[PDB]
Amino acid sequence: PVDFTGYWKMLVNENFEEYLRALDVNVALRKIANLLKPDLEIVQDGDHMIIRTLSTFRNYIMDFQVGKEFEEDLTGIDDRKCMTTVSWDGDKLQCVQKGEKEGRGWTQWIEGDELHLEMRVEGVVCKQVFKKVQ
Ligand SMILES: CC1=C(/C=C/C(C)=C/C=C/C(C)=C/CO)C(C)(C)CCC1
Numbered sequence: 001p002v003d004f005t006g007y008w009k010m011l012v013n014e015n016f017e018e019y020l021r022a023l024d025v026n027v028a029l030r031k032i033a034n035l036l037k038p039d040l041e042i043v044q045d046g047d048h049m050i051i052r053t054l055s056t057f058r059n060y061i062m063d064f065q066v067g068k069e070f071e072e073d074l075t076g077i078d079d080r081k082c083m084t085t086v087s088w089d090g091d092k093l094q095c096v097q098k099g100e101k102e103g104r105g106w107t108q109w110i111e112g113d114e115l116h117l118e119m120r121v122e123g124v125v126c127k128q129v130f131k132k133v134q
């Protein structure tokens with residue numbers, strides 16, 4: 001199916017402040033986070049994926065099997081714990097992060113040579129787009 005493997009650089013990041021505000025991230029950290037332009041480093045073998053969000057401040061590592069619920073420790077972000085499931089939805093990845101915040105999750109997919117990531121919480125939608133360096 002779709003292989004997201006790649007070192008992806010951020011081109012677009014819309015509404016990230018609002019998204020972090022909804023996660024109750026403190027103003028200080030939001031200030032910094034919004035100028036980080038994290039890379040996405042993905043290594044995938046079928047339904048097994050490691051997704052590393054990389055920045056000079058902090059990294060965030062996801063390591064999961066598509067379709068299989070797991071205990072997600074969002075330490076360094078909002079330091080919350082979710083019961084998270086990343087599922088196939090055709091060629092898209094659909095992540096649901098069950099926990100304190102309503103409607104928390106994200107959708108990831110490829111359009112041509114672009115990786116699209118939409119992150120959501122409580123009706124806030126942050127839009128990110130990434131590209132590999134050719
Ligand atoms: C706030 C904050 C950060 C937030 C990272 C986030 C919110 C990553 C979401 C990654 C996803 C949804 C990958 C799915 O392919 C990072 C840790 C960069 C630096 C410290 C500040």
Ligand code: NA
Nearest residue numbers: 050062063064
């Ligand atoms: Na692992």
